[PDB]
């Protein structure tokens, strides 16, 4: 299963089935053993948006990073595309980018052909954390230019849209 | 065709944005009223 099955005076997580229940019990929530079900459950995403907890950050980072690695190695497809679409949908929320996706894209961009999951890849570059334009170019924008100078004109318009979305987000 | 496609895409994204805004609203009033109740109780 791509998304782990959720396993549970703190409010029990299973009893969380309605929005008013979350409204009443937001203070006494308990962190799940696995937070993958947080992705497809918007109820826990509401508490995740403000929890700002250090351990759960690392726990979700390692989770999603190893999940991305195993999905990518198993691909070489529709389920992978759907999972990445769900990740992108969650990324639209929280108004901030993830780091597991950033590391995965850094690792896979040089190996990227430009057509495996282009739709999926180009929407992650939109949500890239703000950084000085002196470390990303040597690692990220070089291969971006490599593809840009040689790929299709429609791919050029595509990466233009991606970078303008990045500029808007920044 | 790209222009239409992005038009409906932006419309859908805007509707989703209002949905999220509405939900986080009652989230905010619930959090504020809970905080006030806890402050008054102590």
């Amino acid at each position: 299963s791509v998304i782990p099955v959720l396993n549970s005076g703190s409010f029990p997580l299973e009893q969380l089935q309605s929005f008013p229940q979350l409204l009443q019990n937001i203070h006494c929530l308990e962190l799940p053993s696995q937070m993958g079900s947080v992705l497809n459950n918007s109820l826990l995403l509401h508490y995740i948006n403000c929890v700002r907890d250090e351990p759960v950050l690392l726990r979700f980072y390692y989770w999603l990073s190893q999940t991305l690695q195993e999905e990518c190695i198993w691909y070489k497809g529709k389920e992978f595309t759907n999972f990445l679409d769900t990740i992108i949908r969650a990324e639209c929320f929280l108004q901030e980018g993830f780091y597991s996706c950033e590391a995965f894209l850094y690792k896979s961009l040089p190996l990227w052909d430009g057509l495996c999951c282009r739709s999926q890849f180009l929407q992650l570059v939109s949500w890239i954390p703000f950084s000085s334009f002196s470390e990303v170019k040597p690692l990220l924008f070089d291969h971006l230019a490599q593809l840009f100078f040689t790929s299709t004109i429609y791919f050029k318009c595509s990466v233009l849209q991606s970078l303008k979305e990045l500029l808007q987000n920044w | 065709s790209t222009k239409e496609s992005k038009n409906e895409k932006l419309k859908e994204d805007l509707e989703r944005e209002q949905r999220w805004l509405d939900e986080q609203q009652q989230i905010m009033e619930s959090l504020n009223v809970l905080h006030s109740e806890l402050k008054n109780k102590v």
Partner: peptide
């Protein structure tokens, strides 16, 4: 949307 449209353009 428009990105899916561009992808279906490279499909051509």
């Amino acid at each position: 949307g428009v990105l899916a449209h561009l992808e279906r353009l490279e499909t051509q």
